[PDB]
């Protein structure tokens, strides 16, 4: 797709889980249910504004769910909870 230097898919959302976090645990699996209802809102937002870039939910459990789906970009050290955009919304200066 254009304005997206990668290959994307609008049919669903991708979920990133950091390496140090084991997917399949009770905390992570319980997070994958109530975050599955975010995909419909993700699609609805893009329909109103087609010129919409990544929209992502950063969980306190660690996983980040973003739309549209796209494969993740050595080893991976990304943690959504340490990103500058997550930190400013988690507290005040």
Ligand X SMILES: *[C@@H]1O[C@H](CO)[C@@H](O[C@@H]2O[C@H](CO)[C@@H](O[C@@H]3O[C@H](CO)[C@@H](O)[C@H](O)[C@H]3NC(C)=O)[C@H](O)[C@H]2NC(C)=O)[C@H](O)[C@H]1NC(C)=O
Interaction of residue 75 with other proteins, rule CB under 8 A: yes
Interaction of residue 22 with other proteins, rule CB under 8 A: yes
Q: Identify what 52 binds: other proteins, ligand X, none; CB under 5 to 8 Å per kind.
A: none
Burial degree of 8 (CB within 10 A; 0-12, 13-18, 19+): middle
Contacts with 83 (C-beta within 8 Å, 6 or more apart), sequence order:
58
DSSP category for residue 64: E
Q: Identify what 37 binds: ligand X, other proteins, none; CB under 5 to 8 Å per kind.
A: ligand X
**Interacting residues with ligand X between 9 and 48 (CB under 6 A):** 33-34, 36-37
């Amino acid at each position: 797709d254009a304005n997206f230097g990668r290959q994307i898919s609008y049919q669903h959302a991708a979920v990133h889980i950091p390496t140090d976090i084991y997917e399949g645990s009770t905390i992570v699996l319980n997070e994958l249910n109530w975050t599955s209802a975010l995909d419909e809102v993700f699609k609805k937002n893009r329909e109103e504004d087609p010129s919409l870039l990544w929209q992502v939910f950063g969980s306190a459990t660690g996983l980040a769910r973003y739309y549209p789906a796209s494969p993740w970009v050595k080893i991976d050290l990304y943690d959504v909870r340490r990103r500058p955009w997550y930190i400013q919304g988690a507290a005040s200066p």
